Amino acid sequence: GNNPYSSFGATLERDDEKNLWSMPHDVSHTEADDDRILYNLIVIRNQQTKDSEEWQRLNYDIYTLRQIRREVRNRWRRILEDLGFQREADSLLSVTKLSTMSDSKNTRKAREMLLKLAEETSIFPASWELSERYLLVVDRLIALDAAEDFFKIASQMYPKKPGVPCLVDGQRKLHCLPFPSP
Predict the structure, then answer these.
(1) Is 61 exposed, middle or buried (0-12, 13-18, 19+ CB in 10 A)?
(2) Which residues fall within 8 angstroms of residue 48, CB to CB, at 6 or more apart?
(3) How does it sit in the membrane?
(4) How would you class 8 by CB atoms within 10 Å of its CB: exposed for 0-12, middle for 13-18, buried for 19 or more?
């Protein structure tokens, strides 16, 4: 059931009284603190039972995170596709020419996608965070038919620079169709 707990009576004298906990503990937080501190609520689960109303809320808060992922993709799909520039934005969310749908709930899987989104591409330069509401606002900008600008900015976050991996030459390709025998 519950994991082992440290014995009481430890020596706190060697440790600072203020220590690091509560709001200060949220200093190392990721760009969106709501996600990091949310998982903190899960820690309480280690202290809490399924009954626990707050930890459930952790799940419902992350679920909402799923909602941001779905709406944005629906935006990228419409901004880049209408112009045909679909590949760059595809790359950041997870639309690598892969059509995939899950009737079962993903929830946390959305956050992974957004966090990784920022690391490989940014629509606006990397110091730009991508939220569902801002992005949607940016969408209306695309409405002006100036999307090529996105490419220049999004590219600019992840431009081809030294240290790029090289594809090994000499690979053998498979025959898509059969050919006459010798």
Answers:
(1) middle
(2) 54, 55
(3) Peripheral membrane protein; Lipid-anchor
(4) exposed
- 69, 114 contact by CB (below 8 A): yes
Cα–Cα dist 17/101, whole Å: 51
| CB contact set of 95 (below 8 Å; sequence gap of 6+) | 73, 76, 77, 86, 89
**Amino acid at site 163:** G
Q: How far apart are CA 22 and CA 26, in angstroms?
A: 7
Question: Which among 94, 96, 88, 97 is positioned nearest to 123, based on CA atoms?
Answer: 88
DSSP states of 5-72 as a string? -PPSS---TTS-SS-S-SGGGGGS--SSHHHHHHHHHHHHHHHS-TT-HHHHHHHHHHHHHHHHHHHH
Task: Work out the angle at residue 46's Cα, subtended by the Cα atoms of residues 37 and 42, and round it to the nearest 5 degrees.
Answer: 25
Method: NMR
